[PDB]
Amino acid sequence: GDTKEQRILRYVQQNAKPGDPQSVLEAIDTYCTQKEWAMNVGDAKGQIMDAVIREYSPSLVLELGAYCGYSAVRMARLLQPGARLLTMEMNPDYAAITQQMLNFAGLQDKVTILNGASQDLIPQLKKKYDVDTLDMVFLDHWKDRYLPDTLLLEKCGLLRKGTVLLADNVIVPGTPDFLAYVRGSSSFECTHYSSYLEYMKVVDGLEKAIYQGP
Ligand SMILES: C[S@@+](CC[C@H](N)C(=O)[O-])C[C@H]1O[C@@H](n2cnc3c(N)ncnc32)[C@H](O)[C@@H]1O
Ligand SMILES: O=C(c1ccccc1)c1ccc(O)c(O)c1[N+](=O)[O-]
Ligand SMILES: [Mg+2]
């Protein structure tokens, strides 16, 4: 049966230019603005995400929550040669859509999709995926997981001094426990970026929280 995510992918395949990431983004944003809302980070917050990627030039980025691959396309198109994005997605239907989206955009060789729940996969990164530490983490999964995954990332030794966490939706729907943690901790230097919830003019924001060590 047909789904929102299939409709988004078909719209991209119909209208965007193969191998052109910006065209893929614009197609998604046009479809979601004109026809059907979706939980992509969107262009307004996406421009802030772009600025963070450019500033920090991360070699290894971890995304929590891929969905249809919008944010993965956004980040991966700005990664330097040899840099990599790992993106965790627990829903196999969405992981499949994301793979096709990346393939269409021509970014598949810069991204690895990890199928599973972040709480299960994060502790396997050092053993199974050869990870030392992460340069950046984009949190955009179910909001109740931001805090426990942040703690787990620290416990597992995946954060180093200067690792950038970038969290979506800290205003709407809101991530109160995660914000209280990073804003209460001397291990994080934080900046708030006020913006808009995807495809609307309701205010939302991203939190940049840079790990300083224990
Ligand atoms: C808001 S959508 C991600 C949007 C995407 N970052 C973008 O901007 O294009 C949230 C996604 O997180 C996934 N998800 C929720 N909890 C997860 C978890 N614990 N581990 C991995 N994926 C999870 C959901 O299945 C869903 O696809
Ligand atoms: O929680 C929702 C949600 C809640 C209710 C209805 C639709 C979506 C949502 C809304 C905007 C986001 O950017 C986002 O990442 C999420 N999320 O699901 O993770
Ligand atoms: Mg979001």
Swiss-Prot record:
The N-terminus is blocked. Residues 1-214 are extracellular. This is Catechol O-methyltransferase. GO terms for molecular function: catechol O-methyltransferase activity; magnesium ion binding. Binds 1 Mg(2+) ion per subunit. S-adenosyl-L-methionine binds at V41, E63, S71, E89, M90, G116, A117, S118, Q119, D140. Mg(2+) binds at D140, D168, N169. Belongs to the class I-like SAM-binding methyltransferase superfamily. Cation-dependent O-methyltransferase family. It catalyses: a catechol + S-adenosyl-L-methionine = a guaiacol + S-adenosyl-L-homocysteine + H(+); 2-hydroxyestrone + S-adenosyl-L-methionine = 2-hydroxy-3-methoxy-estrone + S-adenosyl-L-homocysteine + H(+); 4-hydroxyestrone + S-adenosyl-L-methionine = 4-methoxyestrone + S-adenosyl-L-homocysteine + H(+); 2-hydroxyestrone + S-adenosyl-L-methionine = 2-methoxyestrone + S-adenosyl-L-homocysteine + H(+). It comes from Rattus norvegicus. Catalyzes the O-methylation, and thereby the inactivation, of catecholamine neurotransmitters and catechol hormones. Also shortens the biological half-lives of certain neuroactive drugs, like L-DOPA, alpha-methyl DOPA and isoproterenol. It is an enzyme of class 2 (transferase).
